[PDB]
Structures are given as C-alpha cells and as structure tokens.
Curated annotation (Swiss-Prot):
GO terms for cellular component: chloroplast; mitochondrion. Its cofactor is Mg(2+); Mn(2+). It comes from the Eukaryota. Endonuclease RNase P responsible for the 5' maturation of tRNA precursors. Preferentially cleaves at the unusual cleavage site, but also able to cleave at the classical cleavage site. Also involved in the maturation of mRNAs in mitochondria. Zn(2+) binds at C250, C253, H451, C468. It comes from Arabidopsis thaliana. This is Proteinaceous RNase P 1, chloroplastic/mitochondrial. GO terms for biological process: tRNA 5'-leader removal; tRNA processing. Binds 2 Mg(2+) or Mg(2+) ions per subunit. Disruption phenotype: Embryo lethality when homozygous. Mn(2+) 2 binds at D378, D396.
C-alpha cells in the first residue's frame, strides 16, 4: 500500500538522521493524497527534533516544519499517544522557544487532548531561564486547569522565578506546594530555599501582629504540620543547616516536629488500587487465592519481605538473616506474634533440614505464604502490610518501576509510617529501624518557623540534612 511505503521510508530517514528527506517525503505524500496516521506523524516529529537552531541566522526548516507538522497532526484529528507527546516535547526542547512550546499545549487543549507533564516543561523552564515570571505563572495556571500535577523540577522553577522577581507571596505558595506534593527536597531545591530565607526580600516580609486563633484553626484544618496563612514574624531569618534527633527534635532550635496523621479512608483507596494494579500483572487467580488465604489468617503485627531479608548485603540467600529478623520482629510484638513471611515457593522447597522444617513450622503456624512460580512477591507483601494495617519489614530500595505506579502522595507517607529496615553491625548484629515518631516533611510551625528536609536515597546510610529557618 502507499501508506506502508511512507512508513517504510520514514523508518530509514530517522535511522539515517536525514531530516531534509523526511520533509521531502512528507510533502510528496500530501501531493500524492496519502493520509498520515499516528505512526507517520510521530516519526516526522522525532526526525525534525534531531535538528538544532542556528546561533547565527534564522532557525533551520527542521524545527520550523516540526511545529507545522504537529499543528497539522492536531488539525487532522490523528490521535496522539505517548510517543507523540515525547516527540513534540523534544522538538520544543531543541527549539528552546518557550512561547511556541506553550502554543502546542494550548492547541492540545483547544482540540480536547490532555497534555502531559513533559509537554509543559519546555514552556515552563524556558520562561524561567528568561526570568519571565508572568509567563511561568500562566503556564502553571494552565497545568492547574488541565489537572496536570507538577513534580519537583517544575515547582523549583516556579520557586526560582518567584525569588528572581521578589514575589514573596509566590515563594510562600510554592513552598506550600513543595510541602504538599514533594515533602523532602533535592539538593538544588534545598540550596535554593536556603538562599530565599537568607535574602533581603525574606528579611523584609512578615507581620509582627497576627491572629493566633486563625492560625491554630488553620493547623487543625490542614491535617497538621503547617498553617498556610502567610509569613509570620519580622526581621532577619536565622537559617542553619542542621539535623533532627531520633525524636524529631531540631538540634539547632529544639522545636519538636509533628507527626502527621494518615486518613484511614485514603488507606482503603490505596488498598483497592494495589489490588487493581496487582491483578493487572499477576495471574488473577494467584492474587485472589492470596487474598482469600490472608482473610483466613492473621492477625499480624508485621509482614516480612522474605527474599529481601535473605539477600540484602549477602552474597547468597542467608537463612540466618531471615530467621534472625523473624525472631526480632516476634520479640517486639506485644503478644509475640510471628511476622507473616512472604517468600517464593521455590525458596521454601532451604536445603539444611532443620531450616526447611522451620519454614514449614512457620507455614503451619499461619505465618508464611509461599508465592507461586512467576509471581512478583512485592504485590503480596505490599497488599498484606496495607490490609493488615501493620509493619512492613523490607530494605527494598523501591527503585523498580512497580513502585512508581503507586504514586508520590499517599504511598511515601504510608511507607514512612509502616516500613522497618534492618541494619547489621559487627559489634551488635542485627537491628530493626522503626518508623520515626514524626513526619519527615517540610513543616511550618504556628509561629512561622520552618524546617525543610533534604531528600536522600537511604537515610540510614545518609544522615539527613535539614534547614532550620527561625526569625531572630
Ligand atoms: O534562573 C533560572 C530560572 C529557571 C531555570 O529553569 C533556570 C535554568 O534552567 C538554568 C539557569 C537559571 C535558571
Ligand atoms: O480487578 C481485580 C483484580 C484483582 C483482584 O484480586 C480482584 C478482586 O479480588 C476482586 C475484585 C476485583 C479484582
Ligand atoms: O508517635 C508517633 C508519631 C508519628 C508516627 O508516625 C508514629 C509511628 O509511625 C509509630 C509510633 C509512634 C508514632
Ligand atoms: Cl540442619
Ligand atoms: Zn529548628
């Protein structure tokens, strides 16, 4: 067919890197009357984005036509898919015209298409480089109306543009957004927040009289750990890099941070999403069978990721480390409940006979579920800990794609409250590291003192740095 030739020839044009040939083949198809489908359009947008814009004379027809091709795709009502948005975005990034990036997003919306987060990036980061705060806030308002949630890079851009234009109101609001959506901040956002609090504008914003009643009312109302009523106090901020002790006490100022509740209704929603997500990947009958088993067992104070407890920091599966963990979890259980061990059936059948007999004893005591061949254990230990409302014992770093499906609002908060990690020393052996008695999140106290935590990969490996910003 003629459409299958365009497909065949554009495939090679990208793989060569010839944009001029892809643009010739584009026009030939219009002069031949051949309709372009999803696939054809995506390859052109990608191919066009291999071009750069000229430092000397007007930009090259690869990028210029790229946007025209995109505009035409939308006009034609060719359905965009995830490769469309990626390509249109990398076209916008190479072009580096924030104004034109923002047009694509406006077209998408005009034609009933839901823009992606990566669509907004070129516009937002361009306007930020340029210092055009008003345009950045336009892009932001457009995301909000499109219900596309920013992540940390977009929020940091918004923060920095707000700092650049002395807009203390936007700094405040953006800081609350970081609290709400990100919780702990990257190193570059952390440095940026420190600069804000040390700056003249920050020194010069505030109020020395305020209604203590309305603040306290706002603290109750927000769920705790913030009030949202604006900057309080006056004068220079004391801004110190510091740490929290194990009880959430700031080492600089002695403020004890608060522990923020989780709403049990959000937990039930999450439980249902786990079930849905798991059923999509596991054999449905396997996950059902586990849920039915779980309904007939328990109660549990803890759930163990048995593969991770056998393997973390080991050359091969350590039954010693699994068993030591089981024993320690049982010892801290107020009634000495055995923890529920989730482990692959292949690993249940350990080749030292007393260990195999113990694994079978645990099963017989209602405290071991052997997951079937082909299963991903993670769904099982997550579903169990969530549903049994108990501790989850795993050092899984949660780098896997699976965990990205769980979202970045509820699940990180839940994890903080439920996750136990093991650590081992030469001197002392194995230790359980329990959930902290405070929430590791940006906090704003009732007198307007701020504590801002840095994000780290593992906070047992890394001593987590915090900012303490307190009026002098
Ligand atoms: O000042 C900047 C504001 C936003 C932004 O994205 C940016 C950047 O990406 C590189 C240098 C400076 C800035
Ligand atoms: O949609 C489902 C996927 C898995 C699963 O176990 C399940 C279930 O157990 C009950 C209703 C729906 C589902
Ligand atoms: O006292 C606690 C405050 C917060 C919190 O998350 C917590 C916890 O997760 C386990 C025991 C005590 C606390
Ligand atoms: Cl033995
Ligand atoms: Zn402090």
């Amino acid at each position: 067919s003629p459409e299958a030739l365009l497909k065949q020839k554009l495939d090679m044009c990208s793989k060569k890197g010839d944009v001029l040939e892809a643009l010739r083949l584009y026009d030939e198809a219009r002069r031949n009357g051949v309709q372009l489908s999803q696939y054809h359009y995506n390859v052109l947008l990608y191919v066009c984005s291999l071009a750069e814009a000229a430092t000397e004379s007007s930009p090259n027809p690869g990028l210029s036509r790229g946007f025209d091709i995109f505009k035409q795709m939308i006009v034609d009502k060719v359905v965009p898919n995830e490769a469309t948005f990626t390509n249109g975005a990398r076209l916008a990034v190479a072009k580096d015209d924030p104004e034109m990036a923002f047009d694509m997003v406006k077209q998408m919306k005009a034609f009933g298409i839901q823009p992606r987060l990566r669509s907004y990036g070129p516009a937002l980061f361009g306007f930020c480089r340029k210092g055009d705060a008003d345009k950045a806030y336009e892009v932001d308002a457009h995301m909000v109306e499109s219900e596309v949630v920013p992540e940390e890079p977009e929020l940091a851009a918004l923060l920095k543009v707000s700092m650049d234009t002395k807009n203390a109101d936007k700094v405040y609001k953006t800081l609350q957004r970081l609290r709400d959506l990100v919780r702990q901040v990257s190193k570059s956002t952390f440095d940026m927040i420190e600069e804000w609090f040390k700056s003249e504008v920050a020194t010069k914003t505030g109020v020395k009289k305020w209604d203590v009643k309305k603040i306290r009312d706002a603290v109750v109302s927000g769920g705790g750990g913030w009030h949202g009523q604006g900057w309080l106090g006056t004068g220079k901020w004391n801004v110190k890099r510091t740490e929290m002790d194990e009880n959430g006490v700031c080492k600089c100022c002695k403020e004890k941070l608060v522990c923020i509740d989780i709403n049990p209704v959000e937990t039930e929603t999450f439980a249902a999403s786990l079930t849905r997500l798991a059923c999509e990947r596991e054999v449905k009958a396997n996950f059902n069978q586990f849920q039915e088993w779980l309904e007939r067992h328990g109660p549990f104070d803890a759930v163990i990721d048995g593969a991770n407890m056998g393997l973390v920091n080991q050359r091969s599966f350590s039954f010693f480390q699994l068993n030591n963990t089981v024993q320690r979890c049982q010892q801290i259980s107020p009634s000495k409940r055995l923890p529920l061990v989730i482990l692959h059936k292949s690993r249940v059948n350990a080749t030292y006979p007393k260990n195999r007999a113990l694994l079978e004893k645990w099963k017989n005591a209602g405290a071991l579920y052997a997951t079937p061949p082909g299963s991903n254990d993670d769904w099982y230990w997550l579903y169990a800990a969530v549903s049994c409302k108990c501790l989850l014992v795993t050092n899984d770093e949660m780098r896997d794609h699976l965990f990205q499906l769980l979202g970045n609002s509820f699940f990180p908060r839940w994890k903080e409250k439920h996750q136990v990690r093991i650590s081992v020393t030469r001197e002392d052996g194995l230790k359980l590291n329990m959930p902290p008695p405070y929430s590791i999140v940006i906090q704003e106290s009732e007198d307007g003192t701020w504590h801002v935590p840095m994000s780290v990969e593992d906070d047992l490996q890394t001593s987590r740095q915090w900012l303490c910003a307190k009026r002098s």
